[PDB]
Ligand binder design. Structure first.
Ligand SMILES: NC(=O)c1ccc[n+]([C@@H]2O[C@H](COP(=O)([O-])OP(=O)(O)OC[C@H]3O[C@@H](n4cnc5c(N)ncnc54)[C@H](OP(=O)(O)O)[C@@H]3O)[C@@H](O)[C@H]2O)c1
Ligand SMILES: NC(=O)c1ccc[n+]([C@@H]2O[C@H](COP(=O)([O-])OP(=O)(O)OC[C@H]3O[C@@H](n4cnc5c(N)ncnc54)[C@H](OP(=O)(O)O)[C@@H]3O)[C@@H](O)[C@H]2O)c1
Ligand SMILES: NC(=O)c1ccc[n+]([C@@H]2O[C@H](COP(=O)([O-])OP(=O)(O)OC[C@H]3O[C@@H](n4cnc5c(N)ncnc54)[C@H](OP(=O)(O)O)[C@@H]3O)[C@@H](O)[C@H]2O)c1
Lengths: 474, 474, 472, 474
């Protein structure tokens, strides 16, 4: 019933074509988002380019006032936004409200962090005596139009993590929310417009990525692409962008290296909390357990009982395991489970499917040959791999096509640091589950898990151009 | 006569196919460089990948010792290297020796700057109280194999500006010197090998870029591409690299905005020194003069007499204007001159050509329609454009397809700063000619003049991966 | 009538001895502040030392929540606080309310700036190969108890500029507001307590500095002294503190170097705005005009007419020139004026006194021998000095016993930068009046104008101890 | 026999009064240093003040060239300087040569670190919108004349650690070497003058600190006091300096907190290596062992055998334990030993004295009441204290009048970090002996162990004044 519209040039626009959004919980029609045509995307880019000069000419504090007001409105409407978000991405209702609250906190932190970007005043005298009187005043300037593309699992938090760092830096933002999540992206736009953001400073583009995505990625006006999504689409986007700056937050098959001298109870608690949070539908989540021979059986028992503790059901009952986003994802996860069963994997938990609602599957005795050891199921499946030495554990963790994060569970932290710089990942957590963590911490992946460093400071700095001004002081 | 070989795995290798290098001065055969096949490039990448672990496992100071020894050997052999460099790229002999000396100084500065890369120790308590006990130890780690590709005009200095920042960071370097300049790149390799660099840490790939370039750009092992060259090739490289990190230092049509309240004598001296240094064959050089109506005639007179002061002839006579690199470049520059003459441009200096040896041409009354106003001639041609206001000057400077650098000549520095952040360039020089400057200063271009920030600190940092290690301090 | 009490250990305490506060405007009794005894100061230090562990154990964000709430309460009560502040330091009422608003903004900025203090993770491999496997995790930790002592002219803003950077860093603060200004300091404490600051985290000590000041400066518990005041007291405090860390923001005789190629109208506007703001009772204010021979007459004419534009009267009429703080300050300023008149200084403006209410005096033809050329009058007097060259201008600016700030007025900014690093000051303003500026900018003096670098980032960092943790 | 002279105004000056230097080894006359009068100190300050402008007007790289030449000359003359240093402070000959080598390396690192001091370019727009157009160019400028005062144990290394960071920053240095060590300070001056340092840039003041020290501390010209010495003199200096900036590196009674889950063999090796290096005559050395009840006996046995391994004798035989500096120090250490024996301390090693040559004494069962538990013996005595809990260990470590450094020996590094921020010291070493470490690491003490942060970067920055230049960018 409810018509949703895109924020273009500060006013709400509908489109001729439309996409109907169905709840993953029970196929309930939640609304309709506009399927913008190519010319409407051109008009939205026009508006952003026209609004860029006045936005960039504001003070940093005047720019941050809008972000603070947006955060206040998000906090005020957290219940409604979280309810619709829970209905739309099959997220736990209280977890969805928590996502809205963390989004507000991220917007506030980004607003207050973009006020303190300090440049440099370099002297040439340290490099050569001929240049002793040269002073370079190095500062940061907006790249221009930032195109933010968000994934389904966090269409509010991972949209704001691109919008707020871009907006406080002086850029104007073009938001492309995921189709299953476009309602939540348009509610974030609802809040941004209610906060009084100037017309054209923040715009939304809704539509299928398979049809509108390439046009807006290759667009003339886009000066920066901040994309969070699957590796197949991230590779295509980084290949289509060419020379323009990009951030990619792609897939990740994060490992949990459990060593012999590890607190197996804490390790199991952390691994299950990270692995099966939001039905395994976080990309920064333990997707592999690489455990040595000695402690493998005890860790498998503890992991299996912890997975057995998980509640599986409706998002509004705050179930730990909720339905996966759509039927195709469930089919892919089921195919990985079937492959693992084919190759004699010890299923440590019941394997039941009720359509989208898959039950948490813990696999033991996983080898190289099962696709679940490599492919990111992006669902409630956790393979347990047994290795003989720390060298084999590091080798197996590094054979992945992914480098987002990893976690090392051990008591000797000197060995944990050694493994940490031997691991080809962007972040290593010692005795803790992998997570994006405090959003001031750097967040990056390396080997096909991304391209660029993000986190609030790093994303604010990376969506800006350095401009040096060199003059003579004597 | 003289056979030259590529440094592969610490030993010198020749190839079946060969490229003969002819002096641009008089078509003198200077030697032969190997035209490496695809499998030889594979072997060189193999060697770099194998040598990466031991190189990265060294101390920063042990790594910098090799760079200091290389700089000492370069200083020792500056006369021979500069003589062959002057013969090979038709550079002034004393200017070539100066390039070798600046290369040694750059290697020393990069070696001493990579010793001081300090990480961060971040706390989560400022973002959220739940994470008050989290500590992220953020540091830098090598990307891996850095593929450096150099242009002809500075095959030693712009090779070392990619090698030394990469080597001190812990990366291994694959050098692709330009074919007209490969001899000088192999002499830089000569010095690097004599300094005792470990086998496989620094390798060279010689051959035509049109045939070996795409293979090594798209190679499996290359973890970073540092390319300096023309914009057409830089766009292709940034498009072929896809998701891998790149630096591009592409073309630049730098402008010299001369305002009414400017020191026209100093402005003219600086503009001619920057524009016609090395026959206009520097990319960071004044290629446009955008001068207001009031001072245009006086500036044109001063510029024309300064260009008339220039000596045109042999590189070993230290002529200000030397032969351009090859016949194709001379033909392109001549075509631009012919277009300007077609469209009624006031040639302020004699227009004579003796093959590669073109004479400095100063054009006045240049409009939008002449290709010399837009295309980078990369030669001894300097168009003078007249505009009516500062707004038109800024608009015309920003209409270019390039954003490397610009210089603003005026006496009111407050207006100079205003213009400086209105200019869509990477660096603005106030009352000075554009230059790469002290190599600690940031050097970047924006609008198709590059992708990334370079300069010794920035290039050291940008050829490294961030690695965060997060643990509990409780 | 109104009894005021000190915030000690989160509860309000009165003292046996008392100080009565009289309005500099009309000697109106504004209230009474407690004259704390030595043992009461000991008890307050006890409370701060006891509250330090729990305060330091909070998150930075939990600590900043209290500062944000304090800023909100200050914004809410700006009218009342500014009214009492205007009555108490004879500041313009709208200027006083503006001071309260800037105080709230400073508290907010310090709270949000102390959340982002990031340490370092250093490696030993760049220094020596033997230490390639050593990692130093360098971070910041509170010094402990910070003793903040404020001057009269900004008893709210210059109190918060020491409290908020100290509180967000994890320190507990002992505030000593000026006696003429202690009411405003206790209103700032009123707001800090209403915001819910934990008991003992923020305490106030009221009393005469001449009697309680040395005891609390030399106290056992004080781990840091942040003092803003006159140079004679700052020298004594830096000498009594001994080895403990200190910040001093002492006197400053800031100069306005006006060169020949200068915009004399803009220069005169800026010089008069800086020099006679709050009756010259700001320490970061133009107190000297050093102008070359060529433009001296034009600059003197423009300066004299700008000073003639100034309104002199009641603070609640928002007069540009208000009564000076007390009779002793007026006597000192009058003595400097009398010396200048003795030595044949061209008084360019009327010289009238109505007790505390002095009228803005612009002096020309000032030489070395007049005390107004050197001594900080801290009042509405602006000497104009004429020099023959830029070298003499720089020399005369550097002969001062002060190094707070200076301003260079010229059109050639390359020459302005040259003069700027030839000037022995902490900050040089080019074509602008001297000011503390945006409180993120560094603020320091050098040659007896202070000791240390302040400004929100620098004050947050300088009230903390570095702690390195080195492991393999 | 050999007359030594002070470097004043670039030329060598003798004094009427003289101090004879006697070797602590065998009371051998090593030479005579001038006992400068007050007027000679005035003349030296005059020379420094006169040479300050030209020194400060040099390029940073021109300033660093002199430091590099000084380091080269020190490396060249390391054998002679180390021989005289070993004779003069009774240091091991090979240890003394190692000190000279580390001094050269410190001078080189400080020279290359002072070239890279980069300022800031701050904008007012983040604080208030009214100041959006203000730019502060914040940089560092020399304080002026730096008065460096060195202690006896490292009269070369701890002199250069004040001279090189001061000289590279643009300051001129007034060196006051210790009387027992003034010969080595004048040899460091020998090298500085041979390197060609400009006249008056580096001067030396020799004489008794008890007579010339207060005059030069309270001097008019001294703009900064960098003092390393005992706490009684440091308190006096910080009290006499008043408002002028100071660094103090005072005494330190560093503790070695050994917990139950600790590697007692490694802990004992590290504790004995730190505690008895140079006869306990380093200030950053383990002077207390605070060990829990459980592992106290095993740690005491291991410590006692490690101390029994130590060789006691002549410095030129490279003995681990060498004679203490003078008879008064030996008497003080003997008094502390006698007090410990009085109060029933278990002397775990032989207690023998041959004048200055004391033998390493390891005390067990040490309580609060023995002066050796609190007073810094500054000699070959190591008390072992037993405590019941970690809380008592932290309390006893914090009851000291000193806060230089401490070391925590344990296997659980999370507990080690917890103790580390509970310890009221400047540096905590985890599973390692305390040391000044790599001289890039910060070095500071807190509770009467100093005032200020030192280490090469921190000492370079702290001997400079911040200067902000604020202008309008429009
Ligand atoms: N590392 C991280 O920070 C992080 C965090 C969370 C998730 N992820 C990743 O996100 C993925 C799941 O999200 P998803 O499946 O929704 O992402 P996806 O299908 O790969 O695409 C992500 C976003 O890009 C749009 N898109 C799709 N095709 C496109 C094209 N050809 N051109 C341009 N844009 C296009 C999508 O819109 P439509 O699909 O709605 O058309 C969606 O909004 C997982 O692979 C996970 O690894 C990464
Ligand atoms: N650079 C800056 O940032 C800055 C800014 C504003 C003002 N100032 C300076 O502030 C001065 C005017 O303030 P003022 O005259 O009120 O300051 P003051 O009399 O010199 O003393 C300043 C503060 O210290 C207290 N005090 C007085 N004697 C003391 C002692 N013996 N020991 C410890 N504390 C003592 C005072 O309290 P009581 O006097 O109430 O007892 C007052 O709160 C001017 O000289 C001006 O230069 C500097
Ligand atoms: N934390 C560190 O970095 C560190 C490192 C090493 C040593 N230390 C400390 O150094 C001390 C041992 O050295 P020391 O006994 O030679 O030092 P000291 O006697 O306390 O004095 C240190 C230096 O100051 C001079 N001096 C003496 N009296 C003075 C006065 N009244 N005014 C000014 N200067 C004066 C001394 O010269 P003369 O004595 O020759 O006259 C000597 O050069 C120990 O207490 C140790 O804790 C600290």
């Amino acid at each position: 019933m409810t018509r949703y519209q895109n924020l273009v040039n500060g006013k709400w626009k509908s489109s001729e074509q439309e996409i109907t959004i169905y709840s993953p919980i029970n196929q309930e029609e939640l609304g309709t988002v506009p399927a913008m045509t190519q010319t409407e995307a051109d008009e939205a880019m026009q508006a952003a380019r026209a609004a860029l000069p006045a936005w960039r000419a504001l003070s940093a504090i005047e720019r941050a006032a809008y972000l603070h007001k947006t955060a206040a409105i998000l906090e005020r409407d957290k219940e409604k936004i979280g309810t619709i978000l829970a209905k739309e991405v099959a997220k736990g209702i209280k977890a969805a409200i928590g996502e809205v609250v963390r989004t507000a906190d991220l917007i506030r932190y980004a607003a207050e962090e973009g006020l303190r970007i300090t440049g440099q005043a370099m002297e040439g005298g340290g490099f050569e005596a001929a240049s002793k009187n040269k002073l370079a005043v190095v500062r940061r300037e907006p790249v221009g139009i930032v195109l933010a593309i968000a994934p389904f699992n966090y269409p509010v938090n991972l949209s704001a993590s691109k919008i707020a760092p871009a907006l406080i830096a002086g850029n104007v933002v073009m938001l492309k929310p995921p189709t299953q999540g476009s309602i939540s992206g348009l509610l974030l736009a609802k809040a941004f417009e209610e906060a009084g953001i100037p017309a054209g400073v923040f715009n939304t583009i809704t539509g299928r990525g398979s049809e509108i995505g390439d046009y807006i990625i290759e667009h003339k006006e886009v000066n920066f692409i901040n994309f969070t999504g699957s590796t197949p689409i991230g590779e295509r986007i980084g290949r289509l962008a060419g020379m323009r700056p990009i951030m990619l937050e792609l897939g990740g098959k994060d490992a949990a290296l459990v060593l012999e001298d590890a607190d197996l109870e804490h390790a199991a608690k952390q691994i299950v909390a990270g692995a099966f949070s939001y039905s395994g539908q976080r990309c920064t989540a333990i997707k592999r357990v690489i455990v040595l021979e000695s402690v493998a059986d005890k860790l498998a028992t503890l992991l299996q009982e912890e997975v057995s503790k998980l509640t599986v059901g409706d998002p509004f009952d705050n179930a730990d395991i909720t339905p996966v986003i759509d039927n195709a994802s469930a089919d892919f996860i089921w195919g990985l489970i079937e492959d693992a069963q084919e190759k004699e994997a010890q299923a440590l938990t019941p394997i039941k499917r009720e359509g989208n609602l898959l039950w948490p599957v813990l696999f033991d005795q996983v080898t190289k040959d099962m696709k679940v050891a490599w492919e990111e199921p992006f669902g409630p499946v956790l393979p347990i791999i047994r290795v003989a030495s720390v060298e084999e554990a590091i080798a197996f963790a590094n054979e992945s096509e992914f480098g987002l994060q990893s976690s090392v569970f051990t008591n000797d932290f000197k060995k944990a640091f050694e493994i940490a710089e031997k691991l080809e990942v962007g972040t290593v957590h010692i005795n803790n589950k992998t997570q994006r963590g405090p959003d001031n911490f750097p967040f990056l992946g390396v080997k096909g898990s991304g391209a660029g460093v993000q986190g609030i400071k790093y994303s604010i700095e990376a969506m800006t151009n350095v401009k040096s001004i060199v003059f003579d002081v004597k």
